[PDB]
Each structure stands twice: as structure tokens, then as C-alpha cells.
């Protein structure tokens, strides 16, 4: 059933698009000390999943923050400074976010190729006999 392929590729593109938006929010918040919720932003990472047990779709089961410590900065005159003058910043790593941007885009585009190629197979089956 090549229609099941469209579900797997379609679920893959959804998963890769979630990771790209997560990467976008990490780059936009690599220097954000404050937040709406009173807790410092932590680098986010969507968790992919596979229900292997034929076609196994990839599903996003939630966003999980990185456990690395927040990068402390010595800013004693800052209004949000603690007793020792340290302000805490997100633990976003620039190099690892660029790799995620490259990986998410390439993984997104290769699933379009599979969906397009699988589309041709179904159309060719419609021509069988006739």
C-alpha cells in the first residue's frame, strides 16, 4: 500500500518542520534573560518516536529541554543579578543549532522526493491492464 508511504513521508515532514521551528525559537532566544513565565529559557528539542512492532510513522511525542546549566554572566549592576552578581542565560549552542537547521532542511526535502516517487508508482498502477 503506497498510500501508507504518504503517511510515513507526511509524518516525517511534520516531524522535521517541528524541529525547524524549535531551532528557530532557540536562535531567537540565545540571548534572552527574561521570559513571560518567570523561568529562564532553556534550549528546546522535540523528541521523535517510532512505534516499531511494514510502515512505522515517526511521531513527535513532546518538547524536552536540554539539561545543561544556564550560562552565568557576571553582571553585578544588572537589575536581575543575584546576591553574587550573576545573571543566567540560555544554554543554546550556536554550532549545534546550525547543524539542526541543515539537518532539518535536508531531511525535509528528501521526504518530498520519496512522496513524489511513490506518487508515480501509484499512477503507474492505475494504468495496469488498461
Amino acid at each position: 500500500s503506497l498510500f501508507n508511504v504518504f503517511n510515513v513521508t507526511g509524518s516525517a515532514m511534520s516531524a522535521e518542520s517541528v524541529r525547524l521551528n524549535t531551532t528557530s525559537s532557540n536562535l531567537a532566544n540565545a540571548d534572552s534573560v527574561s521570559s513571560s513565565a518567570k523561568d529562564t529559557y532553556k534550549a528546546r528539542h522535540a523528541v521523535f518516536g517510532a512505534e516499531l512492532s511494514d510502515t512505522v510513522p515517526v511521531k513527535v511525542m513532546g518538547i524536552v529541554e536540554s539539561d545543561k546549566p544556564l550560562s552565568a554572566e557576571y553582571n553585578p549592576d544588572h537589575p536581575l543579578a543575584n546576591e553574587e552578581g550573576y545573571i543566567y542565560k540560555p544554554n543554546v549552542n550556536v554550532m549545534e543549532e546550525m547543524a539542526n537547521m541543515i539537518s532539518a532542511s535536508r531531511a525535509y526535502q528528501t521526504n518530498v522526493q520519496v512522496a513524489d516517487s511513490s506518487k508515480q508508482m501509484l499512477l503507474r498502477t492505475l494504468q495496469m491492464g488498461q
Binding site: A37, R44, V47, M61, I63, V64, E65
Partner: peptide
């Protein structure tokens, strides 16, 4: 259920 997942609703 991923243990300790972030939520999508105002704290």
C-alpha cells in the same frame, strides 16, 4: 509521557 515534557498551556 516523555518524562518531564514541556506543556503548551500557560503555567
Amino acid at each position: 509521557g516523555i518524562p518531564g515534557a514541556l506543556s503548551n498551556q500557560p503555567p
